[PDB]
Amino acid sequence: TSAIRHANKATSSDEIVQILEEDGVVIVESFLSSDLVQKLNDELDPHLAALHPVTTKQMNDLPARSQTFRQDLLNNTLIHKVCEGFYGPTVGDYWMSHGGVLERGPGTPIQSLHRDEAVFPAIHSLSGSGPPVMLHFFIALSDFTAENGATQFIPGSHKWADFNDNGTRDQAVTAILKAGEMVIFTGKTVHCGGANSTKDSVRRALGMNFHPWYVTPYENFYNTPREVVESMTPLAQRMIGWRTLHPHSHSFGWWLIRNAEAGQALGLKP
Amino acid sequence: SNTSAIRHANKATSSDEIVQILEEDGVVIVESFLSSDLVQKLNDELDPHLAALYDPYHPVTTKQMNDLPARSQTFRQDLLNNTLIHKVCEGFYGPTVGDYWMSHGGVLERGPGTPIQSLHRDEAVFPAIHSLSGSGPPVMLHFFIALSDFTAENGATQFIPGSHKWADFNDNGTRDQAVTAILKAGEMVIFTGKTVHCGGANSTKDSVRRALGMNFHPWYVTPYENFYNTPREVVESMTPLAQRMIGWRTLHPHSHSFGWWLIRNAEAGQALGLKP
Amino acid sequence: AIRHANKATSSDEIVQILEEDGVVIVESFLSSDLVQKLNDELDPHLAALYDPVSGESAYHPVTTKQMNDLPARSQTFRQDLLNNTLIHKVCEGFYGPTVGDYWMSHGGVLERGPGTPIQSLHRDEAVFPAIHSLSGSGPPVMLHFFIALSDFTAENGATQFIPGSHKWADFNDNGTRDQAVTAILKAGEMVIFTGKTVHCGGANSTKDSVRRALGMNFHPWYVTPYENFYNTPREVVESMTPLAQRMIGWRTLHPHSHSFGWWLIRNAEAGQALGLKP
């Protein structure tokens, strides 16, 4: 019960979506290869270097910064299958709200329990009856250990009747992960970062937070250089707001320019 | 007393009373909102663009046009900075929301022979919001300016007051519950995305009904229009408030006070070359 | 209670049910190929309907739709439907001796999408008070062939009828909806009814399904058609058979009464007078 179910290579995307619906969190083992993890870390380290006790480090605008995030991660088939299964029929389309690298180094103080969808009071007031909004893919660019303070979760807290109750830390299960392993969770599930005993090792994660088409992304990508945008696939461009969305509700389109496809209107390929 | 109608708001009415009428009734009429000169140049700025859209198998009973900020200077400056619209927006979204922006700005033209519209709520396009019915959060705020006279004969828009509070939004009411909104000049009608309404039939063989709608969203709801193709020279001519209305500035929700719609956790318009 | 009962009956039996009850359901009227050909030809015209330039949405889907002037717009309606032998047999039997000739007053595609309100009980010939005042003793005028271009279900609002209401002595009485029985049809199926038969469209309970129909409303020669077809391009009028041209008012009528003819130009055949072949 007080455990986060693991999903292996033999797990189908339907079962990952089902584990997410019942528990609010799931671990996808062996998601990214160690060679892809290092390629990500190699592309990201110089940007982080252009940033007393160690403090928390963060970085976003990944598409401008990382080619592997631009191509491999934004086009990953498992993430997109889980997205279509999580939002389901009535929603139809989705895009990325936040892509961020998170660093919690030695001596990092422990985080309070929280739900990310608290930034949306109108949805957060619905508690577990609220619609699906945030889908969070947390990839481990380094090992997630108990001592460096791996993120803890409270399974089933996405269904609680009162979201003012964030639970207590003894109901939280640590998510022990290896590099390249992923943890998927909802914006309604209680979680918190851990304290880092390890005063020699830095914990590192890449979060991809998705929204349904009708919820405004946190990240704005108009400043991404045109050449990298034209190098991306149309799916990856739709993820970063450069293409029009196609909700099942308004199938004709949303996020249009003069009732026409947005990316075509400002120079991208049809 | 024996009869009820959409309430009018005169020049001596404050914006607080307009917000009050708006969420008791879901609809309000602001008399003499635009001066005759503003209506005249708005129509003048819009005529050549409509003529280029519609100059060329099908009779044209209906015309639509959007992307107004690129197209109209009076819309770019006068309407997008209008003080009453922003007072009512702040009052409608209130404390918990904080910031807002424009989702859709469109001119609508219904000429002779246009059929009556079905009763509807504009917010049905958001089923996750629509399913909460009258308990749902404020989302759409619609400002409908009359660029021509609104008569029942040319199909003045009809409304059902109080239908924004209904417990079941699968119920759109009946035409016997609808009251017509008669407007003459650049008078305005404000309504919610939860209030049932419909356009009328244009019985006249001569007269064209013309309106300008401005549909606003809270910061967290995706605007229908994308304004990335607006030329930089016209965006730079706009005030920062109007730039935020068309999505070129970051929003500042009360919930996430640090900001939303950012570039590298910094203000978006400055990040892409606009003035701080 | 409506007879969905024309699997194998000939047109004479159809005229017999059509008087006795005022409404009849003809099974398998159009082949699935013709229904697909009609829907394909009609889709672009319905899509362009009131605003050809824009998509006519701005988050406002159009639930109710109407379209006419079909002969200019659809070739299969121009050829297959206007020349259909069963329709002309039924018109023959319904108008009978005294009338002689007939033509089409209205050819229309009708669409009721999700959320469409239920219709009031009515008779179409109420548009002619001088005829409507005669009630059941009045002359035959309107004959309506309603083809289902989609399934006619109880939930999407299939049209309801009151059999025998064409014979009532007082047409101020339109009945009540408990006397109405729904007409359930497949794609190729048709319902025929008179302008004196009480009917109403249903409510569309479905959240996505769109109900679509093609109505062909015919008149006797002496009653003015609702549609004017003179703006039809002459290439299309010349591609039509003389029967189909007479149906859309491009040829003169031959009433039983004034055998010499009606709707002439200088007392001569009209279509020849305006450049069509004899």
Next chain:
Amino acid sequence: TSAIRHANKATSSDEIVQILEEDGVVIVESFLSSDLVQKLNDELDPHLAALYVTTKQMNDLPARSQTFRQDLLNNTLIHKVCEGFYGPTVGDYWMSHGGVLERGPGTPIQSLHRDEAVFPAIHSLSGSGPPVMLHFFIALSDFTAENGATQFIPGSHKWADFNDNGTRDQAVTAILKAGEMVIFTGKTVHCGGANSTKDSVRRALGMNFHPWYVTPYENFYNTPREVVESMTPLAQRMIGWRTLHPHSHSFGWWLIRNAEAGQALGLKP
């Protein structure tokens, strides 16, 4: 140096024709009232905004501007100078092109040129060629050397070889305030200036007239029938809706079935 020879507020139209004969360019002061300039800018602004770089060009003025339809096409000074410019043998004339020109910040300096070069058979006659193009250049905004006021070489319409466009140091700038006009021939060397100003846009209205026998650049037959019917017969002839009456072929030219054309297509006698 040469200078442009300003005029108006007391000069007769014969004097303007004579200055045009001698220099090929002249400046008419206070040609339009400030109120007329404000109508023109008000009527033209929405059409300029919908035309879809600060440079802009627009024509088909009679459909678009009432003040152009009535005030400018009927202006008495323009017609006196036109009859003086074409003179005896020509007789009748009409407008070939009416256009608003907009040149904003960053506008490059133009090459020295002669507009009549679009007519190689006429242009090859150099200074001895017949009068063809007559250009009226009205200032809808201030014309400053800082915003690129047009420069001219007086007397260059006279030159024996039109392959010589002269040099940029023989050029005189034409400074105009607002509603001031500069008239010039299609044979006079000229060029638009560079607009260094980071802030200001230059607006001009050009009216280019032809003798009766030269084809107008603009076709005005798509002009709406009730705006043409609102125009004076003189203004209707300027836009090609009435027959011309050259002194050469006095019976008429540009006819319909050897009858007056505007009457033939439904206009008033």
